[PDB]
Structures are given as C-alpha cells and as structure tokens.
C-alpha cells in the first residue's frame, strides 16, 4: 500500500494579476518519476482549489488565501493567492512550497504508488520544517482534504530566528523560483510517505539561499 523510493519532478513561475493587494499567481507542472483506489477516480477532471494559511515569523503576524483549480491529468496547477492583511512580512517565494501535492501527475506504470490521491477524500496531514541556511526556520502543518468537491488545503505556519539583516525578513531574494526533485519515501512505523529536498532562491545579488525541507504526510481516514 506504501510507496517506493520515487521523486517529483517540478516546475513553477511565478507571475502578478494585471488587476491585482499583496498578491502572488502560481502556474505549476508535477511529474512523478525514479520507479523502474477509489479516490484516483476523483481527480478526472478539473478540480477547484481552496488554500488557507496563517502565519506568524518572529512575531509578525499575516494572511494569505487562495483560489484556483487544478488538472491532475497534465500534472497542472494555477492559483492566485492574495494577502489578507497587507504587504508580507516574508518574500513570497519563501511560502511557494506551502501554498497540494494531490495534482502529480502520475504515469500509468507507477500508479500504484500515488499516497496522495489514496488517502482522498479523507484526506492526509503535511507537517514541515524548512530550515534556511545560516538563518531562520519555518514548521508548518496543514490538513489537504475534500470539503464537497472541492480541494481545500489548511495550513499552520510559524517562523522562529530569523535574522533582521537576513535574505528572508530583509525581502532579498528574487521574484521566482527554480525547478526542484521531490524525493519521496515510505515510513511504515507511521503508515505515511517522508518527503527531502532543498529549495534554492535566487537573491537579487546573485548569490543563492537554501532551504531544506523535511516534509511528513499522514492520512486521516
């Protein structure tokens, strides 16, 4: 029932509304890779999308929710966030990670190994520590479940050490993102996946700043 070692192969860009707030547009393509149900039957078509975060970095409380819909056939994602409580105390790249892994696109030969759509429609929960180097560190939790039809994913978030001359809170790291592997591994001691990769952000100098990841999905039902 507990997946392979396999990885996710995914592209992201990063855009702005032309009518626009404090707002990220998300266009993302997952594909599943590396190997040699009834809740599949729910991600036929395409699917409304709901996200839901609250954070709070070294005391700096905010906002952000989102709309969109997703094609788990082409492994496609698009999304508009927006902040509900002004200009962010964080760079919008730093939260793209956060803000469904539900729509991979998995190739026929590996279908068997999707935890993701398994656990739908009840659900699973994604716990994280990012962790950016010679700075700060973010744990998040989240729940991604069907509320009716439609995808919702609910996240906690909290910040801690993040230095104020530092690439995150001193918002200097560039308005994109780069294409990452998204290792995946069973744990069978908890009936869940493990997830490890690291994120690279360009910074506006030409430098670049990482974050680790250390991601943990269970199911609900």
Not at 64 to 81: N, S
Not at 157 to 181: A, M, P, R, W
Not at 188 to 214: C, M, P, W
């Amino acid at each position: 029932m507990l997946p392979d070692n396999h990885y996710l192969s995914t592209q992201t860009v990063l855009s702005k509304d032309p009518n626009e707030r404090d707002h990220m547009v998300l266009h993302e393509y997952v594909n599943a890779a590396g190997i040699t149900s009834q809740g599949e039957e729910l991600f036929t078509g395409v699917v409304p999308i709901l996200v839901e975060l609250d954070g709070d970095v070294n005391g700096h409380k905010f906002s952000v929710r989102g709309e969109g819909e997703g094609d788990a056939t082409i492994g496609k994602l698009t999304l508009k966030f927006i902040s509900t409580t002004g200009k962010l105390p964080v760079p919008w790249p730093t939260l793209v990670t956060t803000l469904v892994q539900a729509f991979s696109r998995y190739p026929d030969h590996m279908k068997r190994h999707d935890f993701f759509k398994s656990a739908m429609p009840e659900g699973y929960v994604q716990e994280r520590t990012i962790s950016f180097k010679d700075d700060g560190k973010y744990k998040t939790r989240a729940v991604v479940k069907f509320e009716g039809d439609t995808l919702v994913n609910r996240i906690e978030l909290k910040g801690t050490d993040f230095k104020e001359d530092g690439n995150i809170l001193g918002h200097k790291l560039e308005y994109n993102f780069n294409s990452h592997n998204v290792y995946i591994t069973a744990d069978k001691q908890k009936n869940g996946i493990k997830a490890n990769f690291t994120v690279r952000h360009n910074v506006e100098d030409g430098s670049v700043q990482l974050a680790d990841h250390y991601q943990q999905n269970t199911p609900i039902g």
